[PDB]
């Protein structure tokens, strides 16, 4: 099974990939008007926690769940839209495009950093294998 | 032809044809027994990508 | 199970409906 | 790879589809009796095991816009315009019955009324007018024909245009541009729409296209920005994978 | 043939090269009006599937066939064109430019990953030969 | 067991 | 313990 | 018709659109060329040892 | 003729004709 | 035998 820093960096890579996928989903459907069941597309976010196992606040990251933003959805005026409420307002996603771009960049750089950490540890233990030549 | 550079090119050509018709109507004002032209446009076949 | 682990049964089929029935 | 690239790629391709729809609407900004197509993105979430993190996007055309367009005054007794929520009935390409708003009614040498080359449907099947006769169309669709040479006392009704009432939610644009009743609407209203006696047409005015320019402009600006955004992600994922492939080394 | 992992990774490399070739051919001929037979260029796509005939579930990748897309071809109005139909419409390729660009980049990335796999497997097999001096 | 590996299998489609 | 990482936890919010 | 002269029939809209498409098609070809060139280097390094 | 295999007979010469015949 | 390598051969040419 994955051992130590390998487990830690693998968990970090997986969670950063999940974060980037959620950011890409939010940024792609920032203008979607409806979902498959008629409900608006509410922006999704990831929730990060510390693996920890039971007694070690020193572990990787793990995505506990994907939460849906409960911030009020933007309202636009369209009385002809079938999805409009009794007041004629259509709900639109609450995506912050700048926030999504910054999140994508941040997931990218953190992903790269953990890749570098994993490579360094792999080289270190490969050289450890030749202890005493 | 990315399907958006062709569609807008078609519209540009249609507007140019309408302008040619208008210019022909205006140039022939002083002629005797001239009947004015009027340009009629119709959209071509709409393509269906996925059924409702 | 947790993501990245090993299970005894296949994951369910993946499908994305354009419009729900 | 990381299939996050396959999400932004879909978002970039559906944006080009939306742009192709908007450009098609803009090309027909002068088409007589044109109904602009509505475009909307819809999110489909991929179902399966594990964090539901992927939600793709797919364009969508939810019907058309039924807001009446401009009315150009052409002093021609054959060009008619319909009251809002109204439709003229013509015979479709495959011998069926279709609906339209183009009132550019033309008279052939044989005397048959046509719209865009499709026969016009009168109270009882296509309308045939006496050959080479002046035509006047009333407010309720009645057609008066004057035979040249004979005095104006000869003016008599010939046939009545079929005028129907249909909302946006009931009609669907067929592949040839002619609107037809949707399945649910057809099942309740019957196969053929009965003529509404309350519909009023106006003779001597031609209805233009209802392509709103400000919405088109805003849509193109937003589409360009969204495409550039998705392209940023498509570049992030590429570099990330390029670097992640190094772990496979040593 | 190619030992084991050698055969697996070589099959993967060949398949991804074929996919990238198909993508490049689609990108090049995105504006082609005709072919030698007078038929429009239809976008080509490879079919990937595993090859684990001797009683296995995993055996690598092979391209079963190359298939032309069934997405409706793009109709452009041109009545003076000799290839125009009765209505005056000319059929044009259904190539998705963004799709083919993403296919090129993804094929390159996974090709590189398989290169890294084969190189590592060679390294490990090279060290194996020094088992116990 | 497999299909088109790319654009033609990662886009939403109506059902069959 | 933790919460949403990134956007939703790095903006000024009303007390609650 | 005598007393009039016929000019050229070059359409400017068609030419401008074609030039834009040509430029934005080349760029893509140059991207694919760069991708293949970058790919070949690794494959060449595979031949070591 | 499985790709990547060995066959006794040489491969036929490929041709790319621009027009039909 | 062989011919010009590179650009000239991998370019469509009139039949002859």
Is B3 within 8 Å of chain E by CB? yes
CB E106 within 8 A of CB H34: no
- CA nearest neighbour of A113 among A1, A15, A2: A15
Buried b (16+ CB within 10 A) or exposed e, E17-29: bbbbebbbebbbb
Q: Give the determination technique.
A: cryo-EM
Cα distances from D5 to residues A37, A41, D232, E16, H25, in angstroms, run 26, 20, 10, 17, 22
- C-alpha angle with apex C20: C18 to C21, nearest 5 degrees? 130
Question: Strand (E) positions, D29-181?
Answer: 42-45, 55-58, 71-73, 80-82, 86-91, 97-100, 105-107, 113-115, 118-119, 121-122, 125-126, 134-137, 142-146, 156-160, 163-165, 171-173, 179-181
Is F12 within 8 Å of chain C by CB? yes
Dihedral sign computed on CA atoms, order A93, A98, A104, A107? negative
- The pairing of strands D201-203 and D80-82 is antiparallel
Angle between helices B5-27 and D5-27 (to 10 degrees): 10
The resolution in Å comes to: 7.4
Burial class (CB in 10 A: 0-12, 13-18, 19+), E122: middle
Q: What CA–CA distance (Å, rounded) separates J10 from J12? A: 7
- Pick from C12, C17, C18: which is nearest to D48 by CB? C12
Burial class (CB in 10 A: 0-12, 13-18, 19+), D43: buried
Cα distances from F3 to residues D7, D245, E47, H25, in angstroms, run 19, 25, 5, 29
- Pick from B1, B2, B12: which is nearest to H13 by CB? B12
Residue identified by tokens 């009965």 is: D194
- Pick from D47, D48, D58: which is nearest to C18 by CB? D58
Which chain B residues are Cβ-neighbours of D29 within 8 angstroms? 11
Residue identified by tokens 């095991």 is: D49
Q: What CA–CA distance (Å, rounded) separates A127 from A116? A: 17
List the single residue in D with minimal CA-CA distance to A44. D53
Quick check: C11 and D48 CB within 8 A? Answer: yes
Residue identified by tokens 């994305």 is: C16
CB D49 within 8 A of CB A41: no
Which SS3 state, helix, strand or coil, does residue D18 take?
helix
Is F10 within 8 Å of chain D by CB? yes
- Pick from I3, I4, I19: which is nearest to E36 by CB? I19
- CA nearest neighbour of E102 among E27, E50, E5, E48: E27
Which SS3 state, helix, strand or coil, does residue D80 take?
strand
Quick check: F14 and C16 CB within 8 A? Answer: no
* Ramachandran quadrant class, D63 (left: phi over 0; alpha: psi -120 to 50; beta: rest): left
Which chain E residues are Cβ-neighbours of H38 within 8 angstroms? 108
- The pairing of strands E62-68 and E89-92 is unpaired
Rg (CA), chain I: 13
What are the DSSP calls for E66-106, one per residue? EEE--SPPEEEE-TT-TT--TTSEEEE----HHHHHHHHHH
Q: What CA–CA distance (Å, rounded) separates D51 from D80? A: 59
CB D33 within 8 A of CB D65: no
Which chain E residues are Cβ-neighbours of I20 within 8 angstroms? 36-38
- Maximal C-alpha separation, chain A: 79
Output DSSP code: residue F3.
B
CB D141 within 8 A of CB D134: no
Number of H helices, E strands in chain C: 0, 0
CB A106 within 8 A of CB A16: no
Which SS3 state, helix, strand or coil, does residue D124 take?
coil
Quick check: D6 and F12 CB within 8 A? Answer: no
E24 φ/ψ angles, rounded to the nearest 5 degrees? -65, -40
Which SS3 state, helix, strand or coil, does residue I13 take?
coil
CB D40 within 8 A of CB D59: yes
Which SS3 state, helix, strand or coil, does residue A44 take?
strand
Own/partner long-range contacts of E76-85 (Cβ < 8 Å, ≥24 apart): E76/B1, E76/B6, E77/B10, E77/B44, E81/E33, E83/E33, E83/E34, E83/E38
Quick check: D27 and B11 CB within 8 A? Answer: yes
Q: How many other β-carbons are positioned within 10 Å of the β-carbon of residue B43? A: 19
- CA nearest neighbour of E92 among E114, E109, E72, E108: E72
Q: What CA–CA distance (Å, rounded) separates A44 from D55? A: 10
Quick check: E31 and B1 CB within 8 A? Answer: yes
Kind plus residue range of the DSSP H or E element containing E45 = strand E44-49
Dihedral sign computed on CA atoms, order E49, E55, E59, E65? negative
H21 φ/ψ angles, rounded to the nearest 5 degrees? -60, -40
Quick check: H13 and B1 CB within 8 A? Answer: no
Is C12 within 8 Å of chain D by CB? yes
Q: Identify the residue among A12, A32, A112 best suited for mutation to test binding to D, counting D beta carbons within 10 A and taking the highest.
A: A32
CB E97 within 8 A of CB E27: yes
What residues contact I20, with CB distance under 8 A and at least 6 apart? Answer: E36, E37, E38
Is E113 within 8 Å of chain H by CB? no
Which chain I residues are Cβ-neighbours of E1 within 8 angstroms? 4
- Pick from C14, C17, C18: which is nearest to D48 by CB? C14
CB D145 within 8 A of CB D156: yes
- Pick from G1, G5, G7: which is nearest to A96 by CB? G7
- The pairing of strands E44-49 and E62-68 is antiparallel
Which chain E residues are Cβ-neighbours of I6 within 8 angstroms? none
Q: What CA–CA distance (Å, rounded) separates A32 from D44? A: 10
Q: What CA–CA distance (Å, rounded) separates H26 from H12? A: 21
CB D130 within 8 A of CB D111: yes
CB E42 within 8 A of CB E25: no
* Neighbouring subunits of F (3+ Cβ pairs under 8 A): B, C, D, E
Q: What CA–CA distance (Å, rounded) separates H20 from H42? A: 35
């Amino acid at each position: 099974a994955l051992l130590n820093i390998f487990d830690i960096a693998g968990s970090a890579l997986a969670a950063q990939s999940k974060r980037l996928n959620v950011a890409a989903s939010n940024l792609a459907n920032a203008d979607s008007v409806t979902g498959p069941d008629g409900q608006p597309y509410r922006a999704k976010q990831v929730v990060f926690q510390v693996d920890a196992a039971p007694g070690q606040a020193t572990g990787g990251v793990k995505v506990a769940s994907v939460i849906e933003s409960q911030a009020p959805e933007k309202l636009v005026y369209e009385p002809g839209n079938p999805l409009a409420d009794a007041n004629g307002y259509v709900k639109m996603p609450n995506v912050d495009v700048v926030g999504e771009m910054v999140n994508t960049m941040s997931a990218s750089r953190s992903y790269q950093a953990n890749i570098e950490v994993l490579n360094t540890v792999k080289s270190m233990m490969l050289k450890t294998l030749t202890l005493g030549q | 032809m990315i399907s958006s550079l062709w569609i807008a090119k078609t519209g540009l050509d249609a507007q140019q044809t309408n302008m040619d018709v208008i210019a022909n109507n205006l140039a022939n004002v002083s002629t005797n027994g001239f009947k004015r032209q009027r340009a009629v446009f119709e959209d071509l076949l709409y393509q269906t990508i996925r059924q409702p | 199970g947790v993501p990245g682990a090993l299970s005894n049964q296949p994951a369910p089929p993946n499908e994305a409906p354009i419009a729900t029935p | 790879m990381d299939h996050a690239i396959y999400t932004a790629m879909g978002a970039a391709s559906q944006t080009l589809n939306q742009q192709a729809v908007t450009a098609s609407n803009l090309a027909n900004a002068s088409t007589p009796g044109f109904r602009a197509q509505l475009n909307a993105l819809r999110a489909v979430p991929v179902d399966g095991l594990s964090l539901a993190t992927r939600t793709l996007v797919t364009a969508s055309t939810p019907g058309a816009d039924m807001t009446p367009g401009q009315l150009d005054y052409t002093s021609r007794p054959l060009d008619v315009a319909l009251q809002q929520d109204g439709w003229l009935v013509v015979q479709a390409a495959d011998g069926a019955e279709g609906y339209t708003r183009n009132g550019n009614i033309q008279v052939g040498p044989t005397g048959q009324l046509t719209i865009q080359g499709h026969p016009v449907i009168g109270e009882g099947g296509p309308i045939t007018v006496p050959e080479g006769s002046e035509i006047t169309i009333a407010a309720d669709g009645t057609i008066s024909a004057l035979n040249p040479g004979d005095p104006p006392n000869t003016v008599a009704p010939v046939g009545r245009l079929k005028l129907v009432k249909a909302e946006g939610n009931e009609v669907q644009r067929s592949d040839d541009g002619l609107f037809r009743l949707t399945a649910e609407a057809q099942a309740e209203r019957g196969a053929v729409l009965a003529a509404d006696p309350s519909i009023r047409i106006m003779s001597g005015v031609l209805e233009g296209s209802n392509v709103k320019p400000v919405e088109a402009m805003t849509d193109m600006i937003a589409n360009a920005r969204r495409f550039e955004m998705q392209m940023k992600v498509i570049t992030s994922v590429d570099e990330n994978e390029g670097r992640a492939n190094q772990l496979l080394s040593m």
